[PDB]
Amino acid sequence: KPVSLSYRCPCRFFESHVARANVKHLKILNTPNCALQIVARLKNNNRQVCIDPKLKWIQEYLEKA
């Protein structure tokens, strides 16, 4: 089945431009056997936007634990 009806990623908006000052509480979605979908809310626009799992600010925020 080369269509893949179910099991869809929120693996889309891999934006490198991430503002750590405007970033609100990031939500790491618990999707098993997928990429780490880190949907981080933005405090500037009050809208949920995806962040790629390679940003330095997101890596520092994850490692600050």
Chain positions contacting another protein, by CB under 8 A = 1-13, 15, 21, 32-33, 35, 37, 39, 47-50
CB 37 within 8 A of CB 50: yes
Residues in touch with its own copies (CB under 8 A): 20, 23-30, 36, 38-39, 53, 61-62, 64-65
54 binds, among another protein, its own copies, none (CB under 5 to 8 A by kind): none
d(CA 24, CA 12): 20
d(CA 18, CA 6): 30
Closer CB to its own copies, residue 2 or residue 10?
10
